[PDB]
């Protein structure tokens, strides 16, 4: 019944520290030390995904990061991800509480289970049709409302209500491997598929969190229009850094409010269901 | 002169298709196969059976040694490989309980060894660029389809039949699979995209098995089982999958008999000639 | 001054000085390199698949090949690639000066930088919206005009004005990992996405050339229709080689003219912009 919130911070990334934990996992070392402490009465653990941002997205040890948070007793993970927009409604400065993704990563360790010595014993086939924890998604959305940040829900709001900057209540991300950005050809193809944003760090992090029995939700920071618009609006690293810094302030407020909103509810049945889903997805029984 | 290898997928972890005459615990130049190989006969036709995931289904799709499985069967003198694959549906007319004799695929796998050849010392010498436009052995595909007819299973061919001939359960006489890496299932977003591309089913094990079989000079065909990777429905899906396994077992046993009733000398030679004609290094030297 | 590398050499046009073996921080290049001159312009020729054509596309050391040309002082790289056509107006014997691509390769070393000891220390996030050097693209096209080869621009001209064999003034490529050719299902999917050609070797070569601060342009050689047409037109090795041997003399004329055209212009601002793009993409330093 205990609740403990892990926070995985991307580009641009909270409380007074109780302890710094140098941990190891059976999958290797996490990206950095883990800082443990409290937000109000809620226990919380913070972990930077890139550790002085020297580790590219394809080389982050997502297994060790998620497992380390599980081993410190986290029940939830809140994650941030920098991204580029593929659609006109999503402009730099907006946020997206994602609910879908398309995976184009490769060469990353994306599961804890297998038949090799470097993995846990078993064959795990996890359902991923709706790959995030829906309860935690709505917490992020309500947190933005409580902090007087606009929310745009395309299902129930006219397009004229999309007042920027705003938090988009839904969205799909294509995760590319990096480190290069997309070509205009690739951006047009992803947009034609109906995708909303492009990023590099969401997958396999989201999949491993569900394998570990954790509730996971992501808030993406729109820093650019990818490269499907005008040449002045094409992505570079400086464009990504120049927008993260301005938006980090507001995503901090959202994260800290979401931690408090998580602590204000009972999660006994959701945590139980997270664990049961893993056990029922074991094909080796 | 024929010998039929069988690679059993989910539902065939311990097949027992015939009385075991002998066993082969072997390795290959590309590592260990998934399990020991079981030898026997269907009538007078030699047969060898190998569970793709191992006896206890301990090996996930991404970690299956497709190269060792295909090579071990080639080493034993197999001329054909029949494989089973459990799949999910992406289209309205493919429903749980149906079967598909695949003729096409779209590859979204990565990180698997998918060729016997290359420039590394542990690969076979040479560069092989195989044609894959119609990646299966068409003659063996038609034997699987005829075996279903002979076992009283409906066959639906959307090229010549209207949709009212789609009577379930049925063998779809053609179809395309997207092969994904796994182990996780697809998101709704990914499934929507694969459906929009026109793909019929989704699976995790077809590729690179089919590609390696053609590299090895073997006639390969796959029969896929459509199941449901989803009030209560799990018990009905499992009973339905059990019934599908019994049907596929009947199809496999009849197909081995049908293969054995014909001569394959020309087709086997054509399979070997196709490998040689795809050796880029040799054809560059030829000119 | 400039110096042109050619990744993919007659007597009266290429004055061969010598053959060179080099090493790089990322291993050995595919083969030794031929150093020479086209007029007064220094030129280096490097075959992608090595001696005996024993190296398949997925195992080519693109990092070593590009870095070796960088270390020898090249300012430009011109590349040729055989390819299959996905569209009716691109026919065997044509050429394509690509301007776009979609990447379906995996497991290749595609960046010089990273956190492993096998790569240079750092994190490079390169923009790739328009991944080629446009000035060098337009030289390849103008080289074709100078050699009396037809040029077809589908933005300006009409399908009824396409004269073969022609250099297509733009186009997009899907790069697949190989070694196998595509299925018919994959071919039609790529065609439906709007792609023009399919190949195996463009990526990561084009990406690493930009990482190295070099101007890179590719002219593809259409050898086949992949496998979206009739059975006698489905791709195979013999078909690819038969057409390649007949088109290679035209593409040799283009590349030799392009090298002389590059030498006739100043590239000071372009080269400086190439290097400034690399440094501004170094996340670890910013
Ligand atoms: N366009 C983009 N593509 C990938 N990752 C990004 N991060 C920020 N913008 C991005
Ligand atoms: N159809 C094709 N596909 C991939 N690479 C090729 N190279 C030449 N033709 C090709």
Author numbering:
A (entry chain B): 2 to 14, 19 to 56, 58 to 291
B (entry chain C): 3 to 232, 240 to 296
C (entry chain A): 3 to 10, 15 to 292
What text appears in the publication on this structure?
Because the S. mansoni genome does not codify an adenosine phosphorylase, one alternative to fulfilling this activity is 5´-deoxy-5´-methylthioadenosine phosphorylase (E.C. 2.4.2.28) (MTAP). This enzyme catalyzes the reversible phosphorolysis of 5´-deoxy-5´-methylthioadenosine (MTA) to free adenine and 5´-deoxy-5´-methythioribose-1-phosphate (MTR1P). The observed overall fold of SmMTAP is similar to that of members from NP-1 family of low-molecular weight purine nucleoside phosphorylases (PNP), which consist of a central β-sheet distorted barrel surrounded by α-helices, as observed in other MTAPs from human and bacteria. Furthermore, a comparison of the KM levels reveals that S. mansoni MTAP can use adenosine with the same efficiency as MTA, which is one fundamental difference between S. mansoni and its host and reveals a potential target for schistosomiasis drug development.
